[PDB]
Amino acid sequence: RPLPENEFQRQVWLLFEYPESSGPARIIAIVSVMVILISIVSFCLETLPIFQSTIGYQQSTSFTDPFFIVETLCIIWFSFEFLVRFFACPSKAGFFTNIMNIIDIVAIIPYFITLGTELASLAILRVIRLVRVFRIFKLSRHSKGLQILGQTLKASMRELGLLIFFLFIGVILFSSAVYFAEADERDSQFPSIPDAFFWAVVSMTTVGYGDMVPTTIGGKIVGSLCAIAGVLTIALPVPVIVSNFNYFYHRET
Amino acid sequence: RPLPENEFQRQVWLLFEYPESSGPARIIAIVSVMVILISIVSFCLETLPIFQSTIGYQQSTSFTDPFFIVETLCIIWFSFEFLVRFFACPSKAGFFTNIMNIIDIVAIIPYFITLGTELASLAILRVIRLVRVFRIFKLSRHSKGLQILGQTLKASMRELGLLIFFLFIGVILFSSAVYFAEADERDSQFPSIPDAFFWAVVSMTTVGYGDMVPTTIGGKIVGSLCAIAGVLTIALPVPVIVSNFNYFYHRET
Amino acid sequence: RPLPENEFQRQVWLLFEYPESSGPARIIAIVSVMVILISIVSFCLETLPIFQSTIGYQQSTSFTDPFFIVETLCIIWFSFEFLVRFFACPSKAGFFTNIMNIIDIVAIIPYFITLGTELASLAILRVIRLVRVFRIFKLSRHSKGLQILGQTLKASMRELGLLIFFLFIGVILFSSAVYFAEADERDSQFPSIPDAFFWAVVSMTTVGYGDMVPTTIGGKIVGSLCAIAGVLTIALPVPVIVSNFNYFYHRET
Amino acid sequence: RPLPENEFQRQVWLLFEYPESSGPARIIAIVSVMVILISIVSFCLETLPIFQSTIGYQQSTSFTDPFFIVETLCIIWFSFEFLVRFFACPSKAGFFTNIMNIIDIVAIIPYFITLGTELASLAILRVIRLVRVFRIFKLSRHSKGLQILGQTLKASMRELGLLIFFLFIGVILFSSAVYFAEADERDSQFPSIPDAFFWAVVSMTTVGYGDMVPTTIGGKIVGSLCAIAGVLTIALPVPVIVSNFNYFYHRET
Ligand SMILES: [K+]
Ligand SMILES: [K+]
């Protein structure tokens, strides 16, 4: 809020925090959005089967890999923006409390961990690589819809918990029912109850497991009941989430 | 809210009925939830072939089966809780009227029936085994969302009946239509009308039968009509159920 | 109120039209519902491949076919009920205006046409046979939910028309798009635009065509757009239909 | 609403713009709707493989192709109507501002471009042929529901943008999750992240990819989360679109 009053720190903060403050602020916001989108495209295209061996980018002095070059450019821009915001913040105590800044730090972390490891062990490497996808959330800084979605999810945590709990109850119940209904066959597509968990989830969400359906009569009755109960139970805590989203979406206007 | 008044039955009743009454009450509630979850996990993992022919656990003096040990421990805890609640209840006349106590009683019955059978014949044994899954509802004592769902279902029995009746009407109508539309084929995937019941249910719920679709033109028109009518008819009595759920869910605050 | 004044026609009319009038009226209503359900079960079970070739029942003096016996008994009961109601109606002018009597008449018509054909070419016979399924609507006389659904459909004719028209627009648009996107393939699952009509209907209703999906990139973009647009367009006129149903359903009590 | 006032231009404009003006206006409206439907049927049936090959019509002096004859008749009627409305318009300044006239012009363009090409080279041919499908929107002139849908879409552009943006976020996130969950397999159905985009779209819309499902446990957890999140995120900005549609639909009466 309050400018630093240095006549230069306040100007930089207002340029890098309020896109509507001036023309260069809008240009910088557009550039940041373009860089984020380019980083997303590079992250998606690194996994393409046509193109290191387990990290997606090979570090070299000459920077032979084009994907490494693009990732390095994006990380350099992100680090510049984050450092400049950190230096130009009026109150640096509350800088680390904002989620929109933790998203920014967590999007730069995987690059430096990989570089440090390579300069100086496979499951953790892939875990770090998966954290790279969390930089798509940096669009929340420039998208008000994404911020509204974040507020809705924060305000509807109990509702999400109830939805997951109800789905868990239904999944276990109908998995047990469909296992015990189709247990007396030699070609049972549900060998056990855990094997029927995903079928229960898919039937309840009405995604549909394709042609893999129960073969018995009791199995088909259980499948029909599962299809009904999924619609009946998912749609109970969803309307309150939609109401919260509408409240947070029309509050901006 | 009536205390036992014995100065000793009251202490046990308040500990085992009001988790918020003290610290040990909450510890006991957490322990009970953990035991219920462990029993659920054991029930699900008994059917896994990787880790006694129709029940999933062999009762023996040596207790060789770990699953038998886990089930016995869970049943002992459930029986302890139920017996202590039954003894410490202020009014024992209304104890058996509460659904939350019938759920607790019906979750201990399958273990003792199996024990009596083993101490002293196949389909009924599997039926009793299927009843074991009803102990997942013992979480309703510790989950307010589950109690709210129970109240919603109690208050919306007419609406569930209408939903099932409408689904039955649509299923029979569209099964007849799709059987008679594709009757003049040698490779008809719908040999009869009962064979087309599950396809009708799956199309109406928009679960989707995968690649199995009518091959004729009239069959495809009937399938399109079924897909439309399922959405059109399932979504009529569901909003009132959602309204009942919202009423029972916001009535707490 | 104004009684029929016959002193005998009124007694029969009140018995066969007002189930709440007395105990025998309730017994007759229960018997009629049971007979309707038995007729429905017989109609569904005639088509089973285990159990003449174009009518489902072979007419004989001895009545060898059990299905013919059941159909004859149900038709005799329906004709008795219809004739007694027609004779005992206070105003016979408005008897044929009620839809609940046209349903009753049209459920007896297929039986006598078949009897006349047997006693005294093929497509019309199967058309008449398909008309037999309309006797499931005779439950509307004894079910208030079915009458409420009928009133809702009468009051939402424009809304159903708009839903069908919007689906037609979307189906043609997306069928053209997915044919033109996947035209340049030798293994194209969409040889023409009419062949892509049902895929468009199924994608729009989110039923899902299984594993048959466009193989190109533009085809997959068109499929994603179809999946979005179906949800977005079916859900526009459905809420007004739901509102009409709620109005006709809460007005009952 | 002001007539041309020429006593002949006004008469033509009122005949060709207000169907309720007289009987001939209604006859002309019915004829125009029939011609539009005939053109749509011809466009759909041109692609049928039973019947040059990359343009949809072969030009000859004798007009051998029946489809060319039908398309030429439809285009002649459309051009006559458009020219007569352009000549009979009261104010030609606002003629090009109405969307219902731009739709009319674009639906006639592909025929004249193609004719000029043949009388006096592959991808843009597909583009032009795809543009032919826009003549289905000429029904908006005669259908009030289509105009209401157009108003709803114009008034809900931000909501559509949010829906597409949320879809893109979810698709990228869940495609990355399901690629990295099923990366350590030799039979991985998701070779890369772009190859898993359409699976994510189909799962989120609950269309269902048939029997193609993740084989790992983490893959199935990601699939279940995708199925939940699709329902949870598509249904947030859709209710506001439905509200806009209801506002534009009940405003007539
Ligand atoms: K589906
Ligand atoms: K679905």
Side-chain angles (χ1 to χ4, degrees), chain A residues 2 4 8 13-51 56 66-91 93-99 101-181 183-185 187-251, chain B residues 2 4 8 13-51 56 66-91 93-99 101-181 183-185 187-251, chain C residues 2 4 8 13-51 56 66-91 93-99 101-181 183-185 187-251, chain D residues 2 4 8 13-51 56 66-91 93-99 101-181 183-185 187-251:
Chain A
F8 173 70
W13 173 258
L14 193 101
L15 198 67
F16 274 124
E17 200 32 284
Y18 306 64
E20 336 293 2
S21 78
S22 66
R26 312 258 318 111
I27 301 308
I28 282 180
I30 282 195
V31 161
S32 198
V33 164
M34 287 324 144
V35 170
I36 287 166
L37 291 167
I38 283 162
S39 65
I40 282 154
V41 170
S42 176
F43 170 66
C44 289
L45 266 75
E46 280 149 34
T47 56
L48 216 50
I50 322 296
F51 311 134
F67 284 130
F68 184 66
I69 279 170
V70 174
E71 184 77 5
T72 291
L73 285 184
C74 296
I75 286 303
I76 285 303
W77 177 251
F78 294 157
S79 297
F80 188 46
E81 193 191 0
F82 164 68
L83 281 180
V84 152
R85 284 164 61 87
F86 182 53
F87 282 147
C89 213
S91 172
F95 190 73
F96 273 14
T97 62
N98 211 335
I99 178 64
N101 296 324
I102 318 294
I103 284 174
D104 193 356
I105 330 168
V106 83
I108 307 180
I109 283 154
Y111 180 94
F112 283 110
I113 306 302
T114 301
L115 200 64
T117 296
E118 164 295 339
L119 293 182
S121 72
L122 281 183
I124 37 162
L125 188 60
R126 193 105 63 52
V127 162
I128 290 299
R129 187 177 178 181
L130 187 270
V131 187
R132 279 171 67 202
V133 81
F134 280 9
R135 63 192 177 183
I136 192 167
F137 293 136
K138 271 155 73 54
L139 291 170
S140 92
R141 166 105 55 222
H142 317 275
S143 172
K144 325 289 181 274
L146 210 48
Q147 291 164 351
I148 290 167
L149 179 59
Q151 298 159 262
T152 300
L153 259 64
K154 267 159 217 103
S156 295
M157 255 296 117
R158 165 169 218 231
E159 269 97 317
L160 306 184
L162 276 193
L163 199 149
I164 299 281
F165 181 45
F166 287 168
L167 198 78
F168 158 89
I169 298 295
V171 160
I172 282 195
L173 186 62
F174 287 116
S175 298
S176 300
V178 77
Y179 165 73
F180 284 124
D184 279 324
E185 319 206 311
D187 66 35
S188 183
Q189 315 129 315
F190 314 97
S192 67
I193 295 183
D195 290 26
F197 282 170
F198 188 59
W199 171 91
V201 176
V202 160
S203 289
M204 286 175 73
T205 47
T206 77
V207 169
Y209 211 81
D211 209 313
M212 195 273 245
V213 283
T215 51
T216 60
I217 290 94
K220 291 188 190 296
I221 297 174
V222 166
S224 311
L225 286 175
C226 199
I228 300 166
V231 170
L232 170 144
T233 318
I234 296 164
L236 295 175
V238 157
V240 202
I241 293 156
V242 169
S243 165
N244 295 132
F245 181 85
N246 269 54
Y247 155 80
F248 282 111
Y249 178 71
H250 296 325
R251 216 210 37 222
Chain B
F8 171 70
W13 175 258
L14 198 91
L15 199 67
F16 274 124
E17 250 310 358
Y18 299 59
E20 337 294 2
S21 78
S22 67
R26 274 196 59 61
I27 301 308
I28 282 181
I30 281 196
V31 161
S32 197
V33 164
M34 287 324 144
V35 171
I36 287 167
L37 291 167
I38 284 161
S39 65
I40 278 155
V41 170
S42 175
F43 169 66
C44 289
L45 266 76
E46 274 155 17
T47 55
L48 214 48
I50 309 169
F51 189 162
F67 284 128
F68 183 65
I69 279 169
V70 173
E71 184 80 359
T72 291
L73 286 185
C74 296
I75 286 303
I76 285 303
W77 177 251
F78 294 157
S79 297
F80 188 46
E81 196 191 359
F82 163 68
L83 281 179
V84 152
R85 284 166 61 87
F86 182 53
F87 283 148
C89 213
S91 172
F95 189 73
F96 272 16
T97 62
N98 211 335
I99 178 63
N101 296 323
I102 317 294
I103 284 174
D104 193 356
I105 269 285
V106 85
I108 306 181
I109 283 154
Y111 181 95
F112 283 110
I113 306 302
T114 300
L115 200 64
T117 295
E118 169 297 343
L119 293 181
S121 71
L122 280 183
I124 37 163
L125 189 59
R126 227 154 39 81
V127 152
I128 289 299
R129 188 178 179 182
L130 186 270
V131 159
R132 279 170 67 202
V133 80
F134 281 11
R135 63 192 178 183
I136 193 167
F137 293 136
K138 271 155 72 53
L139 291 170
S140 92
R141 180 177 308 291
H142 317 274
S143 172
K144 325 289 181 274
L146 210 47
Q147 292 164 352
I148 290 167
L149 180 59
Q151 298 159 262
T152 300
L153 259 65
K154 267 159 217 103
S156 295
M157 257 285 124
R158 164 161 217 241
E159 272 109 314
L160 306 183
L162 276 193
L163 200 151
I164 299 281
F165 182 45
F166 287 169
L167 197 80
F168 159 89
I169 298 295
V171 160
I172 282 195
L173 186 63
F174 287 116
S175 298
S176 300
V178 77
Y179 165 72
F180 284 125
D184 283 313
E185 315 212 304
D187 75 28
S188 183
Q189 315 126 318
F190 314 97
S192 66
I193 295 183
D195 290 22
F197 282 170
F198 188 59
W199 172 92
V201 176
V202 161
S203 288
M204 285 176 74
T205 47
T206 76
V207 169
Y209 212 82
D211 212 321
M212 150 150 172
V213 284
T215 51
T216 60
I217 291 94
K220 291 188 190 296
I221 297 173
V222 167
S224 311
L225 287 174
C226 199
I228 301 166
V231 170
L232 169 143
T233 318
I234 296 163
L236 294 175
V238 157
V240 203
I241 295 156
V242 169
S243 164
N244 295 132
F245 181 85
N246 272 50
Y247 155 82
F248 282 111
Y249 177 71
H250 296 326
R251 220 206 45 221
Chain C
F8 172 69
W13 173 258
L14 199 91
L15 197 67
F16 273 126
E17 197 32 284
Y18 303 62
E20 334 301 6
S21 79
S22 67
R26 305 265 317 121
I27 301 308
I28 296 324
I30 276 190
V31 162
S32 198
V33 163
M34 288 319 147
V35 170
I36 287 166
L37 290 167
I38 283 161
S39 66
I40 279 153
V41 171
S42 176
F43 170 66
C44 290
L45 265 75
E46 274 137 44
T47 56
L48 216 50
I50 322 296
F51 310 135
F67 285 130
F68 183 65
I69 279 169
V70 175
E71 193 62 20
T72 292
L73 285 185
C74 296
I75 286 304
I76 284 302
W77 176 251
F78 295 158
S79 297
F80 188 47
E81 190 191 2
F82 163 68
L83 282 179
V84 177
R85 291 163 56 90
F86 182 53
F87 283 147
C89 214
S91 172
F95 189 73
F96 275 16
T97 62
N98 210 335
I99 178 63
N101 297 323
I102 316 298
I103 284 174
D104 192 356
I105 270 175
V106 85
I108 307 180
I109 271 293
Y111 186 88
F112 284 110
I113 308 303
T114 301
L115 200 64
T117 296
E118 281 166 336
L119 293 182
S121 71
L122 281 184
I124 68 85
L125 188 59
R126 228 153 39 82
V127 163
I128 291 299
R129 187 178 179 181
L130 187 270
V131 159
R132 278 169 66 202
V133 81
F134 282 5
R135 57 154 150 253
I136 193 167
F137 296 135
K138 271 156 73 53
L139 291 170
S140 99
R141 158 104 54 221
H142 317 274
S143 171
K144 325 289 180 274
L146 211 48
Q147 291 164 352
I148 289 167
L149 180 59
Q151 299 159 262
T152 300
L153 260 65
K154 266 159 217 103
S156 295
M157 255 300 114
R158 164 169 217 231
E159 269 97 320
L160 305 184
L162 277 194
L163 200 151
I164 299 281
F165 183 45
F166 287 169
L167 196 79
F168 159 89
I169 298 295
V171 160
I172 282 196
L173 185 62
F174 287 115
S175 299
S176 300
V178 78
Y179 168 68
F180 287 144
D184 261 332
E185 318 208 304
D187 58 30
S188 183
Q189 315 129 321
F190 314 98
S192 67
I193 296 183
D195 298 21
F197 281 170
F198 188 60
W199 173 91
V201 177
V202 160
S203 289
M204 283 177 76
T205 47
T206 76
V207 169
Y209 212 82
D211 212 306
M212 151 150 174
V213 283
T215 51
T216 62
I217 290 95
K220 291 187 190 296
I221 297 174
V222 166
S224 312
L225 287 175
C226 199
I228 300 166
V231 170
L232 171 139
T233 318
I234 297 163
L236 294 174
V238 158
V240 200
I241 294 156
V242 169
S243 164
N244 295 131
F245 181 85
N246 262 77
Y247 158 63
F248 282 111
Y249 176 71
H250 295 325
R251 214 201 38 210
Chain D
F8 173 70
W13 174 259
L14 193 91
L15 198 68
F16 274 126
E17 247 313 352
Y18 307 66
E20 337 301 0
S21 80
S22 66
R26 305 258 326 121
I27 301 307
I28 282 181
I30 298 279
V31 161
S32 197
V33 164
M34 287 327 144
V35 170
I36 287 167
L37 292 167
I38 283 161
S39 65
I40 278 154
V41 170
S42 175
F43 170 65
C44 290
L45 266 75
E46 274 143 46
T47 56
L48 215 49
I50 322 297
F51 310 134
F67 285 129
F68 183 65
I69 279 169
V70 173
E71 181 80 11
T72 291
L73 286 185
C74 295
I75 286 303
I76 285 302
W77 178 251
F78 294 158
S79 201
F80 187 46
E81 184 194 5
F82 163 68
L83 281 180
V84 86
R85 290 163 54 88
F86 182 52
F87 282 148
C89 212
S91 172
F95 189 73
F96 268 18
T97 61
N98 184 331
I99 177 64
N101 296 324
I102 284 324
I103 284 173
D104 183 7
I105 316 201
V106 59
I108 306 180
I109 282 155
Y111 183 96
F112 284 110
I113 307 302
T114 301
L115 188 78
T117 296
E118 38 207 311
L119 294 182
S121 72
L122 280 183
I124 37 63
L125 190 60
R126 291 217 289 221
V127 168
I128 289 299
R129 195 172 176 187
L130 179 51
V131 165
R132 278 174 70 201
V133 82
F134 289 124
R135 58 160 144 252
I136 193 167
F137 292 137
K138 271 155 73 54
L139 291 169
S140 94
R141 166 104 47 214
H142 318 275
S143 172
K144 326 289 181 275
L146 210 47
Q147 291 164 352
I148 290 167
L149 180 59
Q151 298 159 262
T152 300
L153 260 65
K154 288 159 226 273
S156 295
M157 256 288 122
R158 165 169 218 241
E159 266 100 322
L160 305 182
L162 276 192
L163 201 151
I164 299 281
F165 182 46
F166 288 167
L167 193 85
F168 158 82
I169 297 295
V171 162
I172 294 268
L173 186 62
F174 287 116
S175 297
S176 299
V178 77
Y179 165 72
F180 284 125
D184 276 317
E185 311 206 303
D187 67 35
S188 183
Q189 333 213 48
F190 314 97
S192 66
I193 296 183
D195 296 21
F197 282 170
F198 188 60
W199 172 92
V201 178
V202 160
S203 289
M204 290 204 359
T205 46
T206 76
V207 169
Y209 212 81
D211 206 317
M212 150 150 170
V213 282
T215 50
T216 59
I217 292 95
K220 291 188 189 296
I221 297 173
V222 167
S224 310
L225 287 175
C226 199
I228 300 166
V231 171
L232 168 143
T233 318
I234 296 163
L236 294 176
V238 157
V240 203
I241 294 157
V242 170
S243 164
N244 295 132
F245 181 86
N246 260 76
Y247 154 66
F248 282 111
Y249 177 71
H250 295 325
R251 221 206 45 221

